[PDB]
């Protein structure tokens, strides 16, 4: 079934008027079913009513309840080289609850409109069945973030090793996590020294070949989610 | 240092005339000059440091010394269904994550098409240059899933993307150390294809978590956990 994210409260009988999003295609008619969700009342199957041949979505039955929000924080530098729509959508698919852009010494790319990021977030959620909408934050400087950082949350970052992340992930005691991936040019030497100086930061290797930032994000999230996260 | 893939043989003194694109790229885009060093490789003779010589205000790269030997080919086979925007990316990520063979697969719900192997191969080279991967993975002619499975080597376990959510316990139980990863198209596998996969004893299903992943996301996430438990991340 198609899935649409809506603003509206969701309950039996809740109505939603197709806001210009009157689709045309995917060519559904009167009586057609789709799934709707809103980020707080879970997932519902709704049926289409059609007053003027406009479209109105009427929620009938709840099909999934609202999960607890995903706790994982994704700290990421925007890239000059490596698409921003892909980075964002993949973070949502891989289970990030918070997307926090980080500005670092070597960043060349820009974040652009947070509006467009949030819209990419919604599209990823609709396509991949994620019912929690991850939060998108305003970009922050890395050093500002590290100074007031909650010590109950471990930051994982990627650094050259043995090149197996698994035994290192296995040693992390904190119940809350954040993955930090830097820009195409990595972290400066000072940034590296500062990360390593933090009690709450752990370095992990990601194999024998250099990975680009977009690759590393999905690869690190996979091993993190499988070892310590919600793939368990 | 920059890294360039070359077709010439490599040894001390080996020369490569930079093509129109390369000269502009190395000299008008990176502004490297006479005596500049860069890295050069060809998929067979390892990786060499070369220096730029110029006979004209035309550039010639002269290999000086070998910095890395040519490694063993990576063994991991990547069996993938076509999707072209996602395809470039797929191909490039596969190289980073260590695939040694890229085998395009036709399945029931395939909607996109390969295009031409020419462009697939150029992407492999780009990725190899960018990430310092010295073995160039081979790109095979597309084949239908049901044909590839007939005489598939009993020796190579196919992992494909179920009841649990964690792939790690399943992956640790794979006795083979020769592997393939299979990822389907956006539309998934038909019921007949699923049956065909579950009925082969050299095939093992793994889950990848509680959210539906895109095929290119799945490919990278799957290769991460396969490399870490069974492959060349260990």
């Amino acid at each position: 079934m198609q899935r649409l994210f809506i603003e509206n409260a969701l309950h039996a009988g809740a109505k939603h008027e197709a806001t210009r999003e009157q689709f045309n295609v995917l060519r559904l008619g009167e009586g057609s079913s789709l799934l709707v969700f809103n980020g707080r009342d879970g997932e519902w199957r709704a049926e289409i009513a059609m007053p003027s041949r406009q479209a109105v979505l009427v929620a009938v039955e709840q099909t999934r309840p609202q999960p607890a929000p995903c706790d994982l924080v994704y700290l990421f530098a925007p890239l000059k080289v490596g698409r921003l729509d892909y980075l964002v959508q993949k973070a949502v698919e891989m289970g990030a609850g918070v997307l926090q852009p980080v500005m670092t010494q070597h960043v060349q790319g820009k974040i652009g409109s947070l509006e467009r990021v949030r819209a990419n977030v919604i599209e990823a959620a609709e396509q991949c069945g994620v019912l929690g909408i991850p939060a998108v934050e305003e970009p922050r400087k890395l050093e500002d973030l590290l100074i007031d950082w909650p010590r109950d949350r471990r930051i994982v970052f990627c650094d050259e090793g043995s090149q197996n992340p698994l035994p290192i992930l296995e040693g992390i005691a904190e119940r809350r996590l954040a993955l930090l991936i830097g820009p195409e040019g990595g972290f400066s030497e000072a940034e590296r020294d500062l990360l390593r100086s933090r009690d709450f930061v752990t370095a992990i290797p990601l194999g024998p070949r250099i990975l680009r930032a977009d690759t590393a994000a999905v690869a690190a999230m996979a091993v993190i989610q499988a070892t310590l996260g919600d793939w368990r």
Side-chain angles (χ1 to χ4, degrees), chain A residues 131-148:
Chain A
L131 312 179
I133 308 306
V136 173
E137 310 289 342
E138 292 278 351
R140 295 277 300 286
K141 281 189 97 93
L142 186 57
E143 303 98 307
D144 288 342
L145 282 171
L146 293 164
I147 289 166
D148 57 4

Side-chain angles (χ1 to χ4, degrees), chain A residues 3 34-36 41-45 61-65 131:
Chain A
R3 189 185 282 93
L34 67 51
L35 293 173
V36 295
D41 302 302
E43 190 180 75
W44 296 71
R45 186 185 54 93
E61 71 182 333
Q62 185 193 260
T63 182
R64 283 156 76 198
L131 312 179

Side-chain angles (χ1 to χ4, degrees), chain A residues 61-192:
Chain A
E61 71 182 333
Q62 185 193 260
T63 182
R64 283 156 76 198
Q66 197 53 231
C70 295
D71 186 61
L72 177 68
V73 179
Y74 172 45
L75 299 167
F76 74 97
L79 303 180
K80 186 195 186 133
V81 173
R83 296 166 64 110
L84 184 59
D85 59 351
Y86 283 21
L87 263 195
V88 162
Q89 298 158 18
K90 286 165 202 277
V92 181
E93 298 177 60
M94 294 302 293
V98 175
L99 277 65
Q100 169 64 257
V102 174
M103 298 309 274
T104 73
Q105 167 86 188
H106 303 145
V107 178
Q108 275 174 307
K110 275 178 176 206
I111 279 304
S113 161
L114 290 191
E115 250 171 34
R116 291 169 84 267
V117 178
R118 282 163 192 130
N120 285 119
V121 166
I122 294 302
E123 159 171 340
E126 289 176 328
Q127 285 296 294
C128 300
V130 211
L131 312 179
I133 308 306
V136 173
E137 310 289 342
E138 292 278 351
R140 295 277 300 286
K141 281 189 97 93
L142 186 57
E143 303 98 307
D144 288 342
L145 282 171
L146 293 164
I147 289 166
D148 57 4
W149 182 270
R151 306 292 198 257
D152 77 343
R153 185 177 301 270
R154 163 86 32 196
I155 296 163
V156 173
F157 86 113
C158 310
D159 197 342
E160 178 177 357
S162 177
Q163 321 133 356
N164 192 342
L166 302 184
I168 291 147
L169 292 167
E170 304 278 21
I172 292 165
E174 291 85 2
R175 313 187 10 106
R176 302 179 182 210
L177 302 179
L179 175 59
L180 167 65
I181 311 288
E184 315 86 290
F187 302 104
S188 66
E189 214 47 76
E191 273 165 350
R192 276 187 213 153

